[PDB]
Subunit: 153 residues, 2 copies
Amino acid sequence: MRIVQATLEHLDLLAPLFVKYREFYGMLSYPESSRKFLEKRLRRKESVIYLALADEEDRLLGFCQLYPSFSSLSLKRVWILNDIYVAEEARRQLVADHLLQHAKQMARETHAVRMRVSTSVDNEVAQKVYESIGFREDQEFKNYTLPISDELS
Amino acid sequence: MRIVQATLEHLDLLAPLFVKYREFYGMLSYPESSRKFLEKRLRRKESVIYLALADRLLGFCQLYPSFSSLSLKRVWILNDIYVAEEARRQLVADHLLQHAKQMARETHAVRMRVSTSVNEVAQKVYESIGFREDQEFKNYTLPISD
């Protein structure tokens, strides 16, 4: 019902929900590393995290995270959309939407050339939601990956 | 023969080669804006530009910062790499990308990413050092502006 930008203040409110998200997608919960990760991001202002809060109290219904980027070619901003997530109790779609919309309106407001998202080939649902809000899988480019570290720890 | 992270002291030297890189990809060379763009990226540490010095600028490469929430780690996105016309085509590139790859290791990134037109020469250069066709993820774009 209400969207707000996460700041260091919300860390404790968002930390537990951030875990649920990672767990829901196949990761080990690492409660502390997860809270530590979010701190660096909130504290260093390296990402924009939107929080969907119920009108009454400050209970996190869902959250969204984007990473700021750029296009050297068109000398304009780009927004990487890494995370989007709603809690069980909350209705996925209703909340996922307000977040994504607020997020997209922000990209527009900041004259971004585009928004780019990347997700597991095994996330049919996740991918469906993305497609329903614009995103396309432009097949006119080849995507590469070079594993450097571990994904598990 | 020498790779170094670009600093604000290199702006004058890097700006023009950066413009030639954009022009190469069919863009309107914005001499100032491109220079303006680099200065801010450099001053705000919103990217990492590695210079290949011989000392005249032989080529450069730039990566933008990203993260993997899932594995709680950094992800480096190799966005630009350009070797000046008057230089071998794959030597300065290897030294640049290798040095980049090494930074990825020293900063514990989960992975490095790179894209390109479906541009055979590039692919041979990237595959030349680890980059494999991403079979773990599915990638999307969504046009936003002009």
